[model samples]
Target: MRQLLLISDLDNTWVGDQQALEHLQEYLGDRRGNFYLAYATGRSYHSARELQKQVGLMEPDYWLTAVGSEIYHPEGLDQHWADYLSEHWQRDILQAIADGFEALKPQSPLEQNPWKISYHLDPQACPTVIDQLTEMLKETGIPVQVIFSSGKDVDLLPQRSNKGNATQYLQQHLAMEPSQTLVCGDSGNDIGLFETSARGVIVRNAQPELLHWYDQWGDSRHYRAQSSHAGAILEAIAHFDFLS
Candidate 1:
């Protein structure tokens, strides 16, 4: 039987400054088919493809892009997405976040909107403002979720979209119950995976909020490496006895 291990979120959890590419290759070389790798991110398919190649992911079995709005299996993959976002729905959600961010300019990072969601950070805005911004967007009734992976960056995603949902979709498709799944991540965007997977591991440098939540969840592990890159991933795999 194939045990499913879902690895989601790329920025800090996987790549980490693009220097981890070599470490990634080594880490992955050890566990070829023991688990399937999937990426859950807010990047568009085009952007993801570029990054994937940069990191040497010649072919990914599945990719959940745009914060779960699009799920791609590539052309040759045996597994495919069972659900996808309609164009109209995607457009509407994008507009909602765009407008919502506009309304938050004075208090937001307010730079160019990416990922169809508004995330603004300026020298003047304090970290506490994240709570304020989240409340303001909630008022729009668009049901967007706010996550601050670092004090300087904020991510806005659909309420229904997350590493959690995408992983659940993967589990269902593979016919494995949630209990057979394990996930590891290191940022606010990764919290959903903690809640969704039967076992969740938070690498070192995870958001404080995530650490706080990890206290309540069992089978959660934390490492000492300051950067949450492929080195940390290998450490976790070895620590969890996933790698012999």
Candidate 2:
């Protein structure tokens, strides 16, 4: 491949195994020009930055943080995404809607953003509570997206916001074809990334929700990796035959 766009979720998907991550870091770093690397995650920019420093992961070209509600480049925050998410986005309104649900607990202040409203619910509070909240938001006529992951984390974002949406937007900005892009992830929140036309990799140690969902409506273009963390990402790149 002359140019390969690789987008991966951090934490368990990309950094869980240090040895494999270091191996991957060296491999990609050696071929940096051939690859366009990006990290997309649910963590806020500050948290992701801190994690990047603590883990000593290789630098990336772009950082899609806060579940893609915000994007940052090497120079600084990507203002185009900022303008896109700002239109008709009511963060406080979504927060108030979530407040109606007693079971939903707000995540840390660091996790919350101007375009993202986050909450944590018990595993027992799924399908029903999440369903009601989704319906209520739709009825309110607000353009919002409800994301549930790990059976505990919930994020309310603009309808146009998500890891996939952010990735797609970047693909357009970069003038890359969908076939040239690849994404890797491990949990339910990553489902949207798999839904895109770009190739996807779901690691072996992924959360059950993502695995079950893939089993139900899996895409042939997406690979189910036999490895975990960075090993899975490396396995996926080869599985998709982008190495050649």
Candidate 3:
């Protein structure tokens, strides 16, 4: 049996389509112990849990939360991963950077975490603001990654913290080859995951900007599904002939 690793984003990529959700549930139930599932989401652990309960999705074997600033397993937080992040996550420095950008307003406290700083920005201001923020942080020699998604949300995280990095960490820790892994997502924040060597699926409902990127950079390993959410995932599974 293949040691499959499936990592997916939560929002529109996993929860919205009823038909897709049903198919996903059935598919996973059938596969059972043959695969490992994880959610890579911008949501906090508490909120991710709430959504999982509300949507009746199966409990994932692992979670990459806060835009991948943190990782959690069924037992609890992945302490080693947490410690790895802490070595370079300086919240005070990030806060100081935030203070310099008037266009960036603090997101709700619920969305922020020690390794991630969440904010909201006007869509029109994003490009300029991002450039400025990048330059400022560069000048300060601060290592961080800034992600803007959904046209309004912005997240700043440690340089090594993002969906791709987290996924790579898990792949190594679990001793799985890139061929054994698949990632699914639908927005800008998910770009990091797509950039990796693992196979990827961009759900049909993905943002135009994301789709555009797929067109420009996608290779054979990256599939653009005609379906949304769980359906998209199912399409990729078939395309890769993973569950045969």
Candidate 4:
């Protein structure tokens, strides 16, 4: 049985140091039977697959992409997840509202999927046009969840579409609890992954946005690693003594 669920974000958290990642891969690979690996990334499916080959990372049992707006397993995309998100994800309406704002620039076609509307938030904007955008959407009763990260990103997704939700979906499917999960990430987009796991790792090189979140909500259950990237994840795993 897979006893530990490790859902790690791709870019910085798991891929910065090739040697460290190799050590990690060997460590986990030896214990693959005990760990259920999942990659929760901001990248789209195609991009995530491309990066896996480019970075020489092992394929995960699960791929939660586009910030968890999409989920895929070895067989293929999870149709059940798509149907669940499609129930209330009004992408066109959200896009329409997003287009009304000058500060919100639509991300590339590839960056967007049917369930996620992404934007690169302009820096010159006010206290927050993000607020205005949400106000309009909520007031219109569109039922979308707005997330901003990196101090310059905007995402409109279904209320239940996030790394946390995606992780929990897998957790429940496997009859595991949040306590049995370990998640690692280093950016604003990774907050959701941390939100659902009791054992979370904030790597040393994490961005300020994620640091601010760690400041506000980090607890004894979460570990702030002294190392970075895969090294940090190794540190966190040892800190929690999951292997022991």
Identify the leading candidate in terms of TM-score. Answer: 2
Q: Name model 2 segments beyond 4 Å from true.
A: 123-127
Off by over 4 Å in 4: none
Backbone clashes counted, model 3: 0
All candidates' lDDT scores? 0.61, 0.89, 0.86, 0.87
Q: How accurate is candidate 2 locally (lDDT)?
A: 0.89
Model 1 local distance difference test score? 0.61
125: Cα error in model 3, Å: 3.4
The runs of at least 3 residues in candidate 1 whose Cα sits more than 4 Å from the true structure, single-residue gaps closed, are 17-24, 76-115, 139-142, 207-209, 212-227
Give the least accurate 10-residue stretch of model 4, judged by summed lDDT.
Answer: 189-198
Best by lDDT, which number? 2
Question: Clash pairs of candidate 4?
Answer: none
lDDT of 1 by residue, 40-131 (tens): 76566677788877776535567877555557775632233322422112435544544554323422332223323545455465666777
Model 4: per-residue lDDT, tens digit, 1-244? Answer: 5679999998988998999999999989888888888999889989988998998988788999998989988899999999999986678877898888988888898888888988998888773688888888887676787777778878888888888889999898777778788999898888887777558999999988889998998887888999999999999999988867
Stretches off by above 4 angstroms in model 3 are 123-126
Model 1: lDDT of residue 142: 57
Q: Residues 1-244, candidate 3, lDDT per residue (tens digit)?
A: 4478999998999889877897788888987788888899999999999998888878888999998888998888998988888885677887788766888888998888889888888655746787788677666666787887877788888888999999999898788778889999999899989988999999999987678789899998899999888899989998998867
